């Protein structure tokens, strides 16, 4: 639900919102919209942060990327939610 004009917005994340991405593979300290998705994501799935079941509910209560979103869980449905949370971990350049 996020126009693809928005997912490109160059930018770039805050000293440990970046220390979460690079420890999943980054490199590089300018990223698009997605590209900062798409790592939260890889993230997401290597520490089994979501509900087994109901695989759409994400836990991070007790996660670094609890401290980022300052909620214990929420669903990745909920696409606007999930960007207005990352953005507070950035500047948009
Ligand atoms: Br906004 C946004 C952008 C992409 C998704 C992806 C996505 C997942 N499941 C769906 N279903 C449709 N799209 N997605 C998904 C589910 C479990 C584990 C990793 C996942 O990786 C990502 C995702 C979810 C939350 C964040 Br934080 C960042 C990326 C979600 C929200």
Partial sequence: QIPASEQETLVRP???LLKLLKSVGAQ?????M???????GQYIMTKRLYDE????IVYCSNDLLGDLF???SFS???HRKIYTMIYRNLVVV
């Fill in 14 to 16: 805050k000293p440990l």
């Fill in 28 to 32: 590089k300290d300018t990223y698009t």
């Fill in 34 to 40: 997605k590209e900062v998705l798409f790592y939260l």
């Fill in 53 to 56: 079941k109901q695989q759409h």
């Fill in 70 to 72: 300052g909620v214990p």
């Fill in 76 to 78: 990745v449905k909920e």
